[PDB]
Structure formats: C-alpha cells, structure tokens
C-alpha cells in the first residue's frame, strides 16, 4: 500500500519498505518519490553547493539494497554523459529546474554521440533511468537558480562511466560524496 510522504523521514521510512525485497517496483518508487512535496527546511542540511560543480551529498544509506542522496546543481553545472552501472536510478527534484538529455549505449565504433532527447525536470517531478532506457546528461542550464535533486540508486553504486560525445569513448570515474548525512566528507 503506497500512501504520500508527509516528509523527507517518512519518504525515506517508506523506501525501506519499498525496498525490503529484492526486487523493485519502479513505477511504485517513482510514484512514491513523486508524491512527496519538498519541503526545503527538511533537506537543507544536505543541500551543500560547491561553487565549481554539483556536489552528491548522502542522505540515507538504505537497507543494503539502496542509497539515497541529494545533489546539488549550480547555475549552469552538469554533468557527463554516463550510465548507471546496472542500478536502477532515479531523480526527484527538489529545487529549480534540470535538463535531462538522453543518448544511446554508442556503438564500438569511434562516432558523435547525438542526443535521442531532452526534457526539462520540473520542480517535485521524479525522473527514471537506467542502462536499458539509455546513458544520460543532466545539467541545470539555469543562470540564476540553483537546483537541488533528490537521487535514489539500487543497488548503490559509485563508479559509473563519462562517455565523450564527440567518439563515444567511455572512461570509468569513482564517484564520491561531498557530504553524508550532513557531514562534509572532504
Ligand atoms: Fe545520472
């Protein structure tokens, strides 16, 4: 039974129970996700910017199935173009508004990689990706507002790849956490 979030603890109470199988109802996580209204004083302990990029701040560590973060985007920070390493993802904005451009898994062969789409995510919109559905890059073009996103990955994951546009090339990077549970982890 899916019932609205009231708050970020109770979102967070609910993906447990959401994740305490082993599988993973995506159109019920997104719904839940969706369903709940950000509310900036619950999560302002999380949403610490860098000045330079977006910053990936951990907010809940999950149950061993999932992790649960919030990433902060300055005016005009984005990020590769990258998959997921085979987890699914997903992305809730709290804050602003993101653009999400969608590519295809490249070929072997050397070429530009050229986008499939793109959509504006929209304040309290939550997003859905994984490797299936593509690779992708996700940048807030905004020149005057920040955008804070609320990200939920299962399995946890932190490497994932940056793949060039202009070849298709792909290059593994470890991704790291600018904070945890409020904490900046230098
Ligand atoms: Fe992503």
């Not at 995506?26 to 950000?38: D, K, R």
């Not at 992790?67 to 709290?94: A, P, Q, R, V, Y």
């Not at 986008?115 to 593509?134: F, H």
């Amino acid at each position: 039974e899916l019932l609205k979030p009231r708050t970020l603890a109770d979102l967070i109470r609910i993906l447990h129970e959401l994740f305490a199988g082993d599988e993973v109802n995506v159109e019920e996580v997104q719904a839940v996700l969706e369903a709940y209204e950000s509310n900036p004083a619950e999560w302002a302990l999380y949403a610490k910017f860098d000045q330079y990029r977006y910053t990936r701040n951990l907010v809940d560590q999950g149950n061993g199935k999932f992790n649960l973060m919030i990433l902060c985007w300055g005016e005009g920070h984005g990020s590769s173009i990258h998959d997921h390493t085979d987890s699914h993802c997903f992305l809730k904005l709290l804050q602003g508004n993101l653009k999400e451009t969608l590519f295809d898994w490249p070929d072997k062969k050397s070429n530009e990689m050229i986008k499939k789409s793109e959509r504006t995510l929209r304040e309290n919109q939550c997003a859905y990706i994984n490797d299936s559905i593509g690779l992708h890059r996700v940048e807030n073009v905004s020149h005057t507002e920040p955008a804070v996103s609320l990200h939920l990955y299962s399995p946890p994951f932190d490497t994932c790849h940056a793949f060039d546009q202009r070849t298709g090339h792909k290059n593994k990077v470890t991704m790291t956490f600018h904070s945890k549970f409020g904490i900046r982890t230098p």
